[PDB]
Design a protein around this ligand. Structure first.
Ligand SMILES: [Cl-]
Ligand SMILES: [Cl-]
Ligand code: NA
Length: 129
């Protein structure tokens, strides 16, 4: 499922991402925009063998089990395929564990490179939130 910008904003807000760990809703939408282009089915294989899964490109090295990343952790205790559902609940729940990991949203390279310090409010603009 390729979310609309405001649709994803509403889903993330409903799931508790708005100001989760002090990151306003626009940060998550922006992160999701540049991680996955709002596509829940987005997958990207990293060079270390791990794969980023879903609307938030959650990595199999630490957070989800895809059965093909030796030495992984699966800290969100989910199959990585659960991060690709049209329902972003698993991605959000896992994102909360990721953003609470210590580095905040810097865990998302796209957020740090393309959303951090930008006018992330623009991403929830015009959204009936
Ligand atoms: Cl959803
Ligand atoms: Cl933080
Ligand atoms: Na894993």
């Amino acid at each position: 499922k390729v979310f609309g910008r405001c649709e994803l904003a509403a889903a993330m807000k409903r799931h508790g991402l708005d100001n989760y760990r002090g990151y306003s809703l626009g940060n998550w939408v922006c992160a999701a925009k540049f991680e996955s282009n709002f596509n829940t089915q987005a997958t990207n294989r990293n060079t270390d063998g791990s794969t980023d899964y879903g609307i938030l490109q959650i990595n199999s090295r630490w957070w989800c089990n895809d059965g093909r990343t030796p030495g992984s952790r699966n800290l969100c205790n989910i199959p990585c395929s659960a991060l690709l559902s049209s329902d972003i609940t698993a991605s959000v729940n896992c994102a909360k564990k990721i953003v609470s990991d210590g580095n905040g949203m810097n865990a998302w390279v796209a957020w740090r490179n393309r959303c951090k310090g930008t006018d992330v409010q623009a991403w929830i603009r015009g959204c009936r939130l």
